[PDB]
Amino acid sequence: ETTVLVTFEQRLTTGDVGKLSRLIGAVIPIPYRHHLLGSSQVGLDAVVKDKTRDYSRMRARMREMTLTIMRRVEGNQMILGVPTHGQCYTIRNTGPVSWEKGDVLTTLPPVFSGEVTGLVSVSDWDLVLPWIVPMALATEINQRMMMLALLSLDRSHEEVRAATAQLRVVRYRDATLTLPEITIDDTVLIDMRNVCISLSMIANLSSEVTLAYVRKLALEDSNMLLMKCQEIYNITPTEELNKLTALFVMIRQITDVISEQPAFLVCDVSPDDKSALCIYK
Amino acid sequence: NWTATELLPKLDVPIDLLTHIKLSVGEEMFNNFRLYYGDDPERYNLSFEAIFGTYCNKIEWVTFLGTALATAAHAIMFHDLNKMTTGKMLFYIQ
């Protein structure tokens, strides 16, 4: 189905539906993809009041949510259109980012700066929306998940907390967004292994051509980026290509680790920066 | 409310502006603005409260004599009763 007529059967007001009327065109996920759904499934809030309440379980759980687009909130009826891949759709923002037209946009959890009443707590249930953040932000906020998960292994707990307090502040396009203050979890641990697996194999699959470049570049040339990199031979080319091909599979694999599911491709950011023609789920 | 602004018929009236209405919400010379750039589905959306009829509780009226207890009473009006002390029926018994 595409048109998901949702009767949120809960006890809502005009001021509630006065918010969704102004939000027609936003992103509501549904877990089930019926034609007829209710308040308890529609809206992502049903999983953010879980007791573990970390990005470990919720990142892997919104990958089973199915995104829809808010249309025509009549009374409590919804027209949540399951978008078919490759059509153009206007998409209303909920994350405080101007979305920088032309980029990949992805679906992130409601970011761990409190817990927003996404609509209003209708009978102790608010309709909380995932933030529709760009590709750079979700990759950076999931990099720092692993950054504080790596140093959760080799330091004392106060120095783990010294790591988290340093890197929980993320400033990216008018958003000062916050790390979960991570509970170390097995779902990240099987992923943090696969990172450290992949990092070792790059040190194997890089021959003596790649790594000799920059360490000889600092011998002769002086560059602005090289001033940070200082602070941080066989003749057969075909096997150098053939080792570098399998190297690039690793760095796409480890990028896909700190990535999430790609989603909406921004076509036309509005001049008021509140809607965007989006395609390519 | 603003759906009432967009749906209902308005008076049309000549109005001046200082500079420009898209800038007149900048320093906010107009109190409580609302601005839309495109085809906006808000006025195509409604709601009620749907209050239905406030039914009155017409309560049943009873009097002392209308109830069945009146046979147990010999009910007498006497208007100078507040002056009395102790009604004291004497019974002579042969």
Side-chain angles (χ1 to χ4, degrees), chain A residues 14 17 20-22 24 72-75 271-272, chain B residues 35-37 40-42 44-49:
Chain A
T14 295
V17 77
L20 296 94
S21 65
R22 294 176 292 174
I24 295 170
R72 196 182 177 183
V73 183
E74 302 296 327
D272 204 2
Chain B
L35 183 64
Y36 289 113
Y37 291 92
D40 194 8
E42 300 183 358
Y44 291 102
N45 196 358
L46 279 81
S47 62
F48 46 38
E49 188 177 3

Side-chain angles (χ1 to χ4, degrees), chain B residues 5-93:
Chain B
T5 300
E6 290 179 349
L7 289 182
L8 293 176
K10 279 84 69 178
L11 289 173
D12 281 329
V13 50
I15 51 174
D16 61 348
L17 293 172
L18 268 296
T19 58
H20 186 71
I21 195 167
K22 193 176 181 180
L23 180 54
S24 182
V25 302
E27 78 272 17
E28 298 178 354
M29 298 303 289
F30 291 101
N31 195 2
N32 195 5
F33 71 98
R34 175 189 58 97
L35 183 64
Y36 289 113
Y37 291 92
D39 310 331
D40 194 8
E42 300 183 358
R43 67 178 181 271
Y44 291 102
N45 196 358
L46 279 81
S47 62
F48 46 38
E49 188 177 3
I51 293 169
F52 307 113
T54 69
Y55 296 148
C56 67
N57 190 5
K58 181 173 284 187
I59 188 56
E60 188 169 358
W61 305 96
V62 291
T63 180
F64 178 74
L65 298 177
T67 67
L69 283 87
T71 181
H74 189 260
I76 309 169
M77 283 192 79
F78 165 52
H79 300 89
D80 294 329
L81 181 136
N82 196 4
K83 311 293 184 291
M84 302 202 299
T85 298
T86 43
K88 50 168 72 173
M89 290 185 181
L90 271 75
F91 297 153
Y92 180 76
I93 293 170

Side-chain angles (χ1 to χ4, degrees), chain A residues 252-267:
Chain A
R252 285 177 287 179
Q253 188 180 4
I254 197 169
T255 302
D256 193 73
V257 167
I258 59 173
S259 171
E260 285 179 350
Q261 177 64 253
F264 296 155
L265 190 73
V266 181
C267 181

